[PDB]
Design brief:
Number of strands of chain A: 0
Shape of chain A: elongated
Structural class of chain A: mainly alpha
Helix content of chain A: 40-55%
Order of helices and strands of chain A: HHH
Strand content of chain A: under 5%
Distance between the termini of chain A: 44 Å
Family (chain A): Belongs to the glutamate-gated ion channel (TC 1.A.10.1) family. GRIA2 subfamily.
Oligomer: part of a larger assembly
Binding site for L-glutamate (chain A): 30-31
Modified residues (Phosphoserine) (chain A): 38
Subcellular location (chain A): Cell membrane; Postsynaptic cell membrane; Postsynaptic density membrane
Protein name (chain A): Glutamate receptor 2
Chain lengths: 42, 49
């Protein structure tokens, strides 16, 4: 039955908790500045 | 609690929580600049947490 059902029919936190995908910003941008000064722990 | 509530979907419009004063308040501008100062540190954001 379930075979049938299974045949009939990602966030900023995620970025922070990983490092595999070299995630970054403009090296010369206010975006880089947002992070350098953010008072948010994350 | 009781944690039986959840926000779903994006905002239906845009609202900004700003400090209000009687039209043309004497503190209107000083409070704007002080608000600016506290927003420059984003004290409000930590206060959110």
């Amino acid at each position: 039955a379930n075979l049938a059902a299974f045949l009939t029919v990602e966030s900023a936190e995620d970025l922070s908790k990983q490092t595999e995908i070299a995630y970054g910003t403009l090296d010369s941008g206010s975006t880089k500045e947002f992070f350098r000064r953010s008072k948010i722990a994350v | 609690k009781p944690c039986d509530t959840m926000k779903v979907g994006g905002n239906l419009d845009s609202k900004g929580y700003g400090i209000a004063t009687p039209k043309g308040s004497s503190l209107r501008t000083p409070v704007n600049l002080a608000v600016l100062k506290l927003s420059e540190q984003g004290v409000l954001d930590k206060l959110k947490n």
